[PDB]
Amino acid sequence: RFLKVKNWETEVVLTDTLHLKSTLETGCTEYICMGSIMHPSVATKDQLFPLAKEFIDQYYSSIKRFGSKAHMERLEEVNKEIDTTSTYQLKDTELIYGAKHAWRNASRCVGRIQWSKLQVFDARDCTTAHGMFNYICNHVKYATNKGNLRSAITIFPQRTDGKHDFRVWNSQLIRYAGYKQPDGSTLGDPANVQFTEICIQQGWKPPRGRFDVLPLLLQANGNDPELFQIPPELVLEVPIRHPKFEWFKDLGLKWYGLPAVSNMLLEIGGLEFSACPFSGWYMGTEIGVRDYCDNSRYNILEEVAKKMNLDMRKTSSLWKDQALVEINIAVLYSFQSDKVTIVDHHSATESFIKHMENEYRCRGGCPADWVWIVPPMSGSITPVFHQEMLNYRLTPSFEYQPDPWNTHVWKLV
Amino acid sequence: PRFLKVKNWETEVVLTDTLHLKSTLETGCTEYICMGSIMHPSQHARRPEDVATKDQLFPLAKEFIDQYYSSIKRFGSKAHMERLEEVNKEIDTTSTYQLKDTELIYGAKHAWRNASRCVGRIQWSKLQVFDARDCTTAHGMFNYICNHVKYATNKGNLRSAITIFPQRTDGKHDFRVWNSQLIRYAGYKQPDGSTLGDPANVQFTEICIQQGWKPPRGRFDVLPLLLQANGNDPELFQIPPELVLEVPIRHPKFEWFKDLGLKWYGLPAVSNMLLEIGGLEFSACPFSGWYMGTEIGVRDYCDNSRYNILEEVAKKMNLDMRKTSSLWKDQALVEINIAVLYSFQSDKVTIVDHHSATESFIKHMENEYRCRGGCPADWVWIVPPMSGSITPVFHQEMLNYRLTPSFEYQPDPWNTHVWK
């Protein structure tokens, strides 16, 4: 079997054979497509054996050592551990390879051209939330690099019985608090109201501002999570101004420079790493379109359009569209002026096409989720809009997991 | 399965879909692979290419007649059982059957209703159906098409319509509109290597010249009609210009915009698709409605392999075009789409912006879940090509599945016609 994907702008046709190696479902069936469902729907010894074998096999094939003496002893060694302990431990090389390939396999990520330049921090010796704090602080400092951002991931101990999970309760390492007011309005980031409330309950004293960096809520070994304040000098921020509109700086907008997802689960050869925060750098539209202009978020379209004296009476003036462009210009300009790494959505999607073509040549394909790859503004003037894409699930992979406050059973009376 | 829920991540509305249980054809996807961004993912058709056997055609007929008599609160009624037996005898004696006027109207409206890629479907039941099954020649097809265009244009107050020519018989006597749309502009391949007019239409334009059309060789030359009746060679016809409503594109603030010399036509009229009803195949079924501004202003004007006018507009706007991060393309794209909408509304020509269209579609989805138990929708196609996430459909999960009656793609007739 082969499948072909066409670019309807360039007429280039790629041939995907890599899809023959996927295993978990997409969510779709032969008669219903579920490609726009956001979330479609511990292992025993016998479940773990073939998962481990498949991973080890692919690692040894990647380093051109399949069938070798070291390959066969590694399989036997892993087999022993799963018999002795009902689990096993990745070598350092395998962990690095696994985390890089989970990124390579993330069908929804447009920044994958960089997948092989991932800095992997092995934190599997950590035992306490204080230790997690220290690992995360070093990650942030390394990743931030005074604005010259570097991709990195820090991997905490894997799941054992599910009663001793390591978890970062934060959804990202740097996020701003949201506070609901009695009059029903929201201060700060409305997305983070729930987690802000949890922090306050755990003892956090909130400044109650618009851009309060949340504390880290860190869980080690299945214990109750603990609060820590990231040291403010490690949190790089960019005040947003516009190159033409002097009034833009008067909105008091800023954003943090380091995007760092901390609520995913990294799955490598059947092992589950429930705490694995990873970071890269921003594409402008993530802040400028979604963070600022989603109705559920900072929702600054009307304010900006107001200051542009736009006709907000009817939609066909396209005042929302016009104001959205200006905000995204401001975001890119602000980050670039402060020499904080950022990528615009045109540069990013163009790289992804180069990346995708390269992956089809060397790997036989590239799983990609069009619904997520196409940017949330200006879709069809970017090359990915015209690019057919096949979506399928390869492992190692990043996976969603339940929010920890929905599952944690609290220890302390 | 049992009931698939779709959630809206803005409003938290959850809708429960059971209508997918009636899906008939494959989507292309499997458990292991999703083809939702493939333009033509599936060749699963309900019948062989041409003249089918009794056991091939009759089940599809019975399915459709059953559905239509169920829709009108009969089923098992006298007329329903008589209709089954009459379609049985007709297939026995002609290898096909003929739809009643009511059945034809029901099927056309439901093909539109089932079109998972159409954001305009809130209007589906308000569709004027012109029965043209008595047509025999390309001249008669021309007459039918002129009447359609005149009725549908309605001096700018556009009305949705479909004109249905004779169904396919053996596959050798097809009726076809060779144009992909009733009204499109020519595309001319220049001797240097560039393109004048619309690049999408260069091949069809060449066929028309290769058929005797004298090209005026402008940028907005309305193409002739190339009509094929009963499998004969196609014939050229010039649509009377007074039937072709056009809008000159100007801008409400940029006075220099009108000097770009752009115009567009008012009537979008798809004429290369096939309409499938109860196993019958209507290969010439031109249908029309009215434009969403982005179809002209984003895709027609700004696609790289189309009119590609972004840089020229951005020039007159005095934008930094050195690097992409200045977002000069995004900025011109907004102004162009303001101009298109402002121009149509100024000339009282029906048009809908992408904010109103997508909001209407959300309402249509809710109506359909409430009365039908679902609504097939292709997210890749429903989300507008600009400003995606500030429209409500961006945040709406959708299930995509194939219901019948439906509109289907078909091969371009010059790839398959044996000339006389």
Ligand code: HEM
């Ligand atoms: C280096 C710069 C990077 C850029 C510019 C980038 C860009 C993006 C964007 C725009 C998205 C869509 C996010 C959204 O719309 O909410 C995304 C998703 C994602 N990124 Fe990347 N990313 C980068 C680095 C990374 C790294 C280092 C990792 C992990 C090692 C990663 C893993 C993912 C995953 C797993 C998703 C989608 C999660 C899901 O399934 O929902 N990315 N990325």
Ligand code: HEM
């Ligand atoms: C009345 C106002 C209408 C509006 C605003 C509208 C809008 C649209 C738009 C924007 C698309 C996407 C097209 C593209 O991006 O190229 C579309 C697709 C489509 N429309 Fe509608 N439409 C309307 C009427 C109709 C009617 C009357 C029919 C048929 C009776 C129809 C059938 C279809 C079909 C079949 C497709 C997708 C073809 C495919 O499956 O690839 N539409 N429409």
Ligand SMILES: Cc1cc(N)nc(COc2cc(CCN3CC(F)C3)cc(F)c2F)c1
């Ligand atoms: C490393 C990196 C760089 C960069 N530029 N952007 C990202 C964003 O990645 C992700 C983005 C989301 C979407 C977040 N919202 C959807 C959920 F409702 C909250 C989920 C996820 F699991 C991700 F991984 C990551």
Ligand SMILES: Cc1cc(N)nc(COc2cc(CCN3CC(F)C3)cc(F)c2F)c1
């Ligand atoms: C009646 C009506 C009103 C309105 N506003 N828009 C439409 C768009 O219809 C269609 C549009 C297209 C796309 C055309 N080509 C561009 C792509 F590469 C193929 C295919 C198709 F099959 C359609 F049906 C129709």
Ligand SMILES: C[C@H](O)[C@H](O)[C@H]1CNc2nc(N)[nH]c(=O)c2N1
């Ligand atoms: C590859 C991709 O499916 C293709 O470019 C699609 C994307 N979405 C679209 N959406 C609409 N409405 N019309 C289109 O032609 C397309 N083209």
Ligand SMILES: C[C@H](O)[C@H](O)[C@H]1CNc2nc(N)[nH]c(=O)c2N1
């Ligand atoms: C309903 C729909 O699946 C949802 O809004 C998706 C659409 N595409 C997206 N694309 C990206 N990059 N990020 C998102 O959060 C979403 N949300």
Ligand SMILES: [Zn+2]
């Ligand atoms: Zn699918």
